[PDB]
């Protein structure tokens, strides 16, 4: 596992429909921010 | 009231007419910022003024996190996580893509993410034990073991 | 020309019928003068539509002034000065505050 594979796996291969984003939004923000995907985490959080 | 309203010529009281109606704040523009966006905008005012007056650049993490010490605990822990993930000894390069692509800084993001997740589970194990002390049998010995 | 545009998010009825009647004249009566009011009213009340039925929240810096409204008084939009409020209206405002979860000045402007 590289960090780059894990970043993609959360953002593209599981995504907002796995992390039930409309019920646990801070958990998907946490998943992206703790994987250092800060730009994607902001471009998620700013939709809500 | 009738004695003051007979007073300007001969009673001696300090009212050159009654007050100007409520007139304290400078013009609020009718304002569409809410309580939280106004508290943030005030912390950005407190940030920009220090740069404009040539002061030491303050930590913007603590100026923003002190707007989450108010209402929503999940926004307080979100700012605690953002703080732990911005606590990084960044080499002062002219390029954010080089720093975000460094092996060393990508190790540091994972080292801090693991430290956050470990202290999260340390808080959860503390609260689980202190909520159940009669089952837990904690005794008088401090330490993670 | 300032300050007075500060209370204008507390009155929980008047501004909403002011929208509804002018939406009625601009749409169902097709009235052209009302279009040049509708644009400005929609630009003003877009926050209200973005959070449908949401109360203005409770605030210690309203709570003080409502509890003190018998001695320090309260300034009200359209009225020049401070109105002194009876203990009855003050206690009715705290009842409506906790009955609906509305801000203490919004309970006064609604009463």
Swiss-Prot record, chain B:
Locate the coiled-coil region(s) and give their ranges.
Answer: none
Its localization reads: Nucleus membrane; Nucleus, Nuclear pore complex; Nucleus envelope
Domain of life, per lineage: Eukaryota
Disorder named in the UniProt entry: Nephrotic syndrome 12: A form of nephrotic syndrome, a renal disease clinically characterized by severe proteinuria, resulting in complications such as hypoalbuminemia, hyperlipidemia and edema. Kidney biopsies show non-specific histologic changes such as focal segmental glomerulosclerosis and diffuse mesangial proliferation. Some affected individuals have an inherited steroid-resistant form and progress to end-stage renal failure. NPHS12 inheritance is autosomal recessive.
Task: Describe its function.
Answer: Plays a role in the nuclear pore complex (NPC) assembly and/or maintenance. May anchor nucleoporins, but not NUP153 and TPR, to the NPC. During renal development, regulates podocyte migration and proliferation through SMAD4 signaling.
Q: Which family does it belong to?
A: Belongs to the nucleoporin interacting component (NIC) family.
What is the protein's quaternary organization?
Part of the nuclear pore complex (NPC). Component of the p62 complex, a complex composed of NUP62 and NUP54. Forms a complex with NUP35, NUP155, NUP205 and lamin B; the interaction with NUP35 is direct. Does not interact with TPR. Interacts with SMAD4 and IPO7; translocates SMAD4 to the nucleus through the NPC upon BMP7 stimulation resulting in activation of SMAD4 signaling.
State what protein this is by name: Nuclear pore complex protein Nup93
What organism does this protein naturally occur in? Homo sapiens (Human)
Source species taxonomy: Eukaryota, Metazoa, Chordata, Craniata, Vertebrata
Q: Where in the full protein does the shown chain start and end, and how long is the full protein?
A: 146 to 290 of 819
Curated annotation (Swiss-Prot), chain C:
The listed locations are: Nucleus membrane; Nucleus, Nuclear pore complex
Tissues expressing this chain:
Expressed in the testis.
Q: Which domain of life is it from?
A: Eukaryota
Q: Which residues carry this modification: Phosphothreonine?
A: 2
For the modification N-acetylalanine, the affected residues are 1
| Protein family | Belongs to the NUP186/NUP192/NUP205 family.
- Indicate the disease this protein is implicated in: Nephrotic syndrome 13: A form of nephrotic syndrome, a renal disease clinically characterized by severe proteinuria, resulting in complications such as hypoalbuminemia, hyperlipidemia and edema. Kidney biopsies show non-specific histologic changes such as focal segmental glomerulosclerosis and diffuse mesangial proliferation. Some affected individuals have an inherited steroid-resistant form and progress to end-stage renal failure.
Q: What does this protein do?
A: Plays a role in the nuclear pore complex (NPC) assembly and/or maintenance. May anchor NUP62 and other nucleoporins, but not NUP153 and TPR, to the NPC. In association with TMEM209, may be involved in nuclear transport of various nuclear proteins in addition to MYC.
What is its quaternary makeup? Part of the nuclear pore complex (NPC). Forms a complex with NUP35, NUP93, NUP155 and lamin B. Does not interact with TPR. Interacts with TMEM209 and MYC.
Q: What is this protein called?
A: Nuclear pore complex protein Nup205
Q: Which organism is it from?
A: Homo sapiens (Human)
Question: Which part of the full protein does this chain span, and how long is the full protein?
Answer: 2 to 112 of 2012
